[PDB]
Amino acid sequence: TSHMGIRITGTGLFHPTEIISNEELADSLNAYVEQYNQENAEKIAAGELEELRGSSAEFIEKASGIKRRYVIEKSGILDPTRLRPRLSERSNDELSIQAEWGVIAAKQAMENAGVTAEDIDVVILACSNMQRAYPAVAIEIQSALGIQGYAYDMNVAASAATFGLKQAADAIRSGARRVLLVNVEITSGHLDYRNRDCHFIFGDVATASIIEETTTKTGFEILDIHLFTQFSNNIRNNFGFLNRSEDAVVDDKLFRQDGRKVFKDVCPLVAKIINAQLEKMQLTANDIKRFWLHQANANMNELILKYVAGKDADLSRAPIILDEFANTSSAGVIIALHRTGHEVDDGEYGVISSFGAGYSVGSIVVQKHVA
Amino acid sequence: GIRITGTGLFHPTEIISNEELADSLNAYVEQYNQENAEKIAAGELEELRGSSAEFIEKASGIKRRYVIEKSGILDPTRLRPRLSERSNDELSIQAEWGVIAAKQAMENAGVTAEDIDVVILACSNMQRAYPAVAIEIQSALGIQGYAYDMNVAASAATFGLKQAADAIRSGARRVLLVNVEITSGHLDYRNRDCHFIFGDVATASIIEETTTKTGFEILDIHLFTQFSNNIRNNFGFLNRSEDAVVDDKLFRQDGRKVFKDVCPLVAKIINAQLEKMQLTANDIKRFWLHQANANMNELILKYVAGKDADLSRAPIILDEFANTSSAGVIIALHRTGHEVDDGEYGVISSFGAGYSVGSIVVQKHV
Ligand SMILES: CC(C)(COP(=O)(O)OP(=O)(O)OC[C@H]1O[C@@H](n2cnc3c(N)ncnc32)[C@H](O)[C@@H]1OP(=O)(O)O)[C@@H](O)C(=O)NCCC(=O)NCCS
């Protein structure tokens, strides 16, 4: 009863068209590993450097549940002479790529919510990486849509959507009418496509949500929010604007992870959060029609789902979209909600729970209202 | 009832005066021109122009600034601070500065780590994307709850104060707001138009639900953004995939156009806010304005107050720190909030890149 009338009333989804199957990608890494492992063969049999392993489509799917992923530009990523998208600098007078994707997803969420630019007071860009420091990309999006009010960029990586939803609900509580929350994840821009353990994890996407105070629109009423962060170096990327002054050389300016430590750390934390949240609301797990969990690893989600809802929880109650999208970082829970929110009936309960880098966890109990 | 109950400030040790900086750039532009005698004459490359300490101070009021590392900035063969990578086990530079300012703010507010529910890092440039350095600051301080990074450049502190106030109204007890500005990391020291503008600093503030603690109670907030390319830095994580070649990956601005747009917008927002709160300029003890250019602040204060407006009513710290982007208003509040007595009013107004403007009416309580 903290957010009476505050509802997610529309979502929108954009992905780039080109697709990389697990096989195209595992092949690409394999080529690069075969040429690196023989270019440096004199030093491989010398204890000095490195021994590179490849991978296969079946190794990816069993570690993750991922099958394919959308990407901004497929040639450069798959090319073993490059291993990164082939993009072109845009002039200042055109929409940046991040603004461009955000606008596409935003127009869809606005149409789904039945609102236009004049109805929106706040724009939040919340994702794991921003294309530039200033002017804020959220302000670029606000201006492209013709929105008046104010906008800002916000980063807490994997949990940026749930943290942003709280910030949206807070701004509405204090007087905002409606908030546009945008998540643009171009993860192919900071993915290390050379590493077998992480090159498959992420895909590209833009999501958007409309949050409004309303007693007359269909949407998900926000009932309770628990945000949590606890510093961890087990996921980290050291690229930044001070690298040039550091004359940096350490090859750690991309995604890096100790996935085993993350697995062991994150699943118990998330399950503890959700269960304490359910007890606080006096809901049982059986009262929850849908768990929209972070969309990174089906093996994590299955563990959490069993910890929270029981070994016999039906799989339809925890929709998986990472099979199609791979990990879209902050946008994951929103994709899942965008695809399956229609599966929740009026009066029924759902839980949105992000978790990942920073160690950040964000968990939101919602209830559907159909008008 | 929400009050700013404590502020904290940190600046690095080494100081650069305008003449050191002008000397340094003049040496670079002469080496550049003494080299390319041909392409200047060939109508290909333009002849770079130098700088003068006299212009800097008359145009802006800045006299000196604190820098993270001095010799690399002044070196005409380098023109950027000399820094070292730290391993993940060590506190990063941005978190380190933020921790120092935060401890001072916490001590000034009479609160400890267990008292804080949210940490916001709000500034114009984050040292990395993930893990958020606000979470690194939260952990270093032993604070529990949650933390996030937030960027709206010049107005990050005022937007962050609004986000802090909103979280408290939703049930947070107290919020720590940190602004760390290592502008020497993204300034273009080759460009005479902008090399003198920015300095380095960190600031912090404690915001609390209280009616019993000395602080500035927040009474109204107006935030505004309007996209403009007149201040822009195109550096980012997609440059690599772009195979970028254009030399626009540092601070860049058209200063005259910024003045024409932002000055009347600021005067209009502050005046509209005083009307809504049924205050007059005469009711405002102190205006803590963005600390970028003293001449502009003076002109803004004349269009808001009146011909007889004491210049002391708009404190200046940019003479000492230069432009400190998001932290500027907080240095002003920290250095001169003691000059506001019980029941008196103040205005905090940040403005600049994005275009962004944030304006806050406060009232002191003792
Ligand atoms: C950046 C700023 C200090 C420059 O001051 P200014 O009075 O506007 O200077 P101008 O851009 O008009 O140019 C002044 C002249 O001196 C020259 N000049 C510029 N920098 C110089 C320098 N460091 N040294 C010597 N001469 C310089 C210029 O070339 C120009 O001559 P030109 O146009 O024939 O080439 C000022 O414009 C500013 O603060 N802009 C930002 C405003 C803001 O942030 N908020 C607005 C508050 S309302």
Side-chain angles (χ1 to χ4, degrees):
Chain A
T1 191
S2 41
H3 303 112
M4 298 191 56
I6 303 178
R7 306 183 178 166
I8 297 153
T9 57
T11 50
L13 162 71
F14 170 81
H15 58 82
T17 67
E18 299 182 356
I19 303 178
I20 283 181
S21 80
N22 277 1
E23 311 141 339
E24 294 169 291
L25 186 73
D27 282 3
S28 184
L29 170 65
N30 285 343
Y32 161 83
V33 160
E34 278 153 39
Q35 161 148 63
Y36 182 81
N37 265 351
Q38 200 203 145
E39 255 302 308
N40 299 257
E42 284 108 342
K43 309 222 291 139
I44 273 177
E48 167 34 59
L49 62 64
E50 209 135 41
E51 328 199 338
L52 288 209
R53 322 240 182 285
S55 55
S56 72
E58 198 173 84
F59 153 67
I60 292 165
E61 183 148 2
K62 201 184 194 310
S64 76
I66 304 165
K67 291 181 189 170
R68 38 198 263 259
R69 79 271 299 128
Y70 302 103
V71 293
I72 184 167
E73 198 284 333
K74 187 161 124 171
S75 310
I77 294 165
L78 289 177
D79 185 335
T81 72
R82 187 182 172 104
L83 301 184
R84 79 192 168 272
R86 311 223 269 264
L87 317 174
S88 186
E89 298 176 276
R90 301 185 173 183
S91 86
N92 281 354
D93 312 52
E94 333 169 37
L95 269 190
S96 68
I97 287 173
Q98 197 167 43
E100 193 207 337
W101 290 18
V103 162
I104 295 176
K107 286 174 159 151
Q108 192 173 82
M110 286 161 80
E111 271 139 37
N112 290 346
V115 304
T116 65
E118 302 71 34
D119 307 318
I120 310 292
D121 291 321
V122 183
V123 178
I124 303 162
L125 182 64
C127 48
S128 75
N129 228 329
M130 314 291 161
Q131 185 166 358
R132 64 171 183 276
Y134 41 91
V137 181
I139 301 171
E140 192 184 359
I141 292 170
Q142 180 204 17
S143 195
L145 302 164
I147 295 175
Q148 320 260 269
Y150 70 92
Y152 61 92
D153 294 350
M154 198 267 309
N155 188 337
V156 61
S159 302
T162 57
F163 277 52
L165 282 170
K166 201 259 191 285
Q167 283 162 41
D170 282 353
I172 300 166
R173 272 192 61 165
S174 302
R177 300 169 300 154
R178 313 188 175 74
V179 171
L180 170 61
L181 177 68
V182 186
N183 326 108
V184 187
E185 296 284 1
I186 310 197
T187 64
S188 57
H190 43 116
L191 201 37
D192 189 356
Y193 284 108
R194 301 159 326 195
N195 194 291
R196 63 162 266 133
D197 293 322
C198 70
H199 78 117
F200 64 89
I201 294 177
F202 293 101
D204 291 357
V205 80
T207 43
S209 296
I210 289 292
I211 313 90
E212 328 171 23
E213 185 175 67
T214 182
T215 36
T216 43
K217 255 179 203 183
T218 288
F220 292 92
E221 186 129 325
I222 297 173
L223 296 184
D224 187 83
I225 302 168
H226 189 260
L227 309 183
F228 174 84
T229 62
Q230 164 183 96
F231 183 58
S232 170
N233 277 302
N234 297 319
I235 309 150
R236 176 141 181 173
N237 178 336
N238 285 325
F239 175 88
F241 75 104
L242 288 188
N243 291 165
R244 186 190 41 112
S245 291
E246 291 159 332
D247 305 308
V249 293
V250 179
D251 179 76
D252 62 353
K253 313 306 192 272
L254 290 171
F255 183 86
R256 180 88 65 191
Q257 175 180 237
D258 184 5
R260 173 187 50 73
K261 280 202 212 347
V262 176
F263 199 104
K264 319 308 150 174
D265 286 342
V266 171
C267 295
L269 193 39
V270 174
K272 156 185 180 41
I273 298 309
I274 300 175
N275 283 324
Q277 193 161 35
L278 294 181
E279 230 153 41
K280 180 184 169 188
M281 290 310 117
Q282 325 167 78
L283 299 167
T284 66
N286 278 0
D287 291 322
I288 302 302
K289 176 63 165 288
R290 290 292 187 272
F291 297 89
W292 298 288
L293 299 183
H294 199 75
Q295 292 294 313
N297 186 342
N299 308 325
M300 278 201 255
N301 295 8
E302 286 156 2
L303 258 298
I304 295 153
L305 179 59
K306 142 172 56 191
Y307 283 11
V308 168
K311 54 182 181 82
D312 302 309
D314 184 73
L315 292 69
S316 72
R317 290 174 67 208
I320 292 290
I321 56 90
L322 61 104
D323 51 0
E324 174 185 359
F325 286 90
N327 189 1
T328 59
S329 200
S330 68
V333 288
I334 306 302
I335 303 170
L337 172 73
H338 179 81
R339 288 284 184 77
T340 65
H342 75 275
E343 304 173 359
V344 177
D345 295 333
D346 174 73
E348 287 187 313
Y349 294 103
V351 177
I352 307 167
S353 306
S354 267
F355 41 90
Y359 295 177
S360 57
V361 176
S363 173
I364 301 179
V365 173
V366 301
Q367 169 174 47
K368 168 95 129 192
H369 296 252
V370 191
Chain B
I2 298 171
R3 305 189 174 172
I4 307 159
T5 54
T7 44
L9 192 176
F10 166 76
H11 58 76
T13 306
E14 290 168 293
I15 302 182
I16 292 188
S17 74
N18 290 341
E19 43 157 46
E20 292 175 305
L21 205 62
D23 290 354
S24 172
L25 181 137
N26 291 335
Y28 162 85
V29 290
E30 213 208 346
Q31 284 172 32
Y32 189 95
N33 289 344
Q34 143 85 349
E35 213 286 340
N36 314 265
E38 64 306 340
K39 313 194 190 178
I40 297 171
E44 168 54 47
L45 301 204
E46 288 313 321
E47 171 217 293
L48 311 194
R49 308 204 268 207
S51 182
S52 95
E54 298 54 43
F55 174 86
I56 302 332
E57 174 166 359
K58 172 153 274 285
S60 69
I62 299 163
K63 307 180 182 171
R64 36 191 280 242
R65 76 282 292 136
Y66 304 106
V67 296
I68 179 170
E69 202 286 328
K70 178 167 165 167
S71 62
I73 291 165
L74 294 181
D75 184 336
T77 63
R78 170 165 181 104
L79 297 183
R80 71 192 187 275
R82 296 205 166 89
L83 313 173
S84 317
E85 300 189 72
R86 305 176 164 183
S87 80
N88 294 347
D89 314 304
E90 321 167 78
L91 199 62
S92 76
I93 283 273
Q94 191 165 40
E96 169 176 18
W97 290 21
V99 167
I100 298 169
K103 296 213 268 207
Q104 189 176 92
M106 288 165 69
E107 179 48 53
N108 281 336
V111 310
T112 48
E114 318 78 45
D115 291 307
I116 308 290
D117 293 324
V118 189
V119 182
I120 307 168
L121 177 66
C123 55
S124 76
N125 221 332
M126 311 301 156
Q127 195 178 342
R128 60 177 187 270
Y130 45 91
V133 358
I135 297 166
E136 188 187 3
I137 292 165
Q138 172 210 16
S139 187
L141 290 171
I143 295 179
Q144 319 229 72
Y146 63 95
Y148 62 93
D149 292 353
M150 195 272 298
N151 187 337
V152 60
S155 297
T158 51
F159 284 48
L161 286 167
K162 158 67 157 44
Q163 287 165 35
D166 284 348
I168 289 168
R169 305 183 205 288
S170 269
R173 300 172 295 160
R174 307 179 181 82
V175 180
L176 165 67
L177 175 62
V178 181
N179 329 107
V180 183
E181 298 282 355
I182 313 171
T183 59
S184 44
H186 45 121
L187 196 37
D188 191 343
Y189 288 105
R190 323 185 296 271
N191 191 344
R192 90 147 168 196
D193 292 332
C194 65
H195 72 133
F196 62 92
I197 290 174
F198 289 95
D200 297 343
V201 83
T203 53
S205 317
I206 304 293
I207 310 87
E208 310 183 37
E209 176 181 39
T210 189
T211 47
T212 76
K213 284 178 73 158
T214 289
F216 293 95
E217 182 149 303
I218 294 149
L219 298 171
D220 188 75
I221 304 193
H222 185 76
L223 307 181
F224 177 79
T225 62
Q226 172 191 287
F227 183 65
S228 173
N229 281 323
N230 287 331
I231 304 159
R232 182 152 179 166
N233 178 338
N234 278 326
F235 172 85
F237 78 102
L238 286 187
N239 292 160
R240 186 182 56 109
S241 304
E242 279 170 324
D243 285 285
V245 294
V246 198
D247 179 12
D248 60 357
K249 269 48 163 211
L250 303 158
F251 182 89
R252 194 169 295 276
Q253 87 164 343
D254 184 327
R256 186 150 299 267
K257 290 179 183 213
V258 170
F259 163 89
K260 297 177 126 107
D261 290 346
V262 178
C263 271
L265 198 78
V266 168
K268 173 191 202 144
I269 282 166
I270 287 172
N271 281 332
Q273 196 167 43
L274 294 180
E275 282 301 299
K276 165 191 185 197
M277 305 305 289
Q278 321 254 339
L279 299 161
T280 74
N282 256 42
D283 295 309
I284 304 302
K285 176 60 158 162
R286 284 296 184 269
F287 293 97
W288 301 285
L289 308 165
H290 205 71
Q291 294 288 311
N293 186 295
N295 299 74
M296 310 200 169
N297 285 10
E298 286 193 47
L299 194 74
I300 285 173
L301 166 83
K302 280 144 163 120
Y303 276 88
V304 162
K307 64 211 202 111
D308 312 298
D310 211 319
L311 287 313
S312 67
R313 305 230 312 210
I316 296 286
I317 53 87
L318 59 96
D319 50 359
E320 172 189 354
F321 296 82
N323 183 4
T324 254
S325 178
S326 72
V329 290
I330 308 296
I331 313 176
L333 182 57
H334 179 74
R335 283 272 177 94
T336 67
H338 72 260
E339 306 174 0
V340 181
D341 309 305
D342 191 71
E344 298 199 295
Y345 295 89
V347 176
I348 306 161
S349 191
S350 65
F351 40 92
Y355 298 153
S356 67
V357 174
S359 185
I360 302 186
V361 182
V362 295
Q363 187 189 39
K364 172 69 146 292
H365 298 242
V366 181

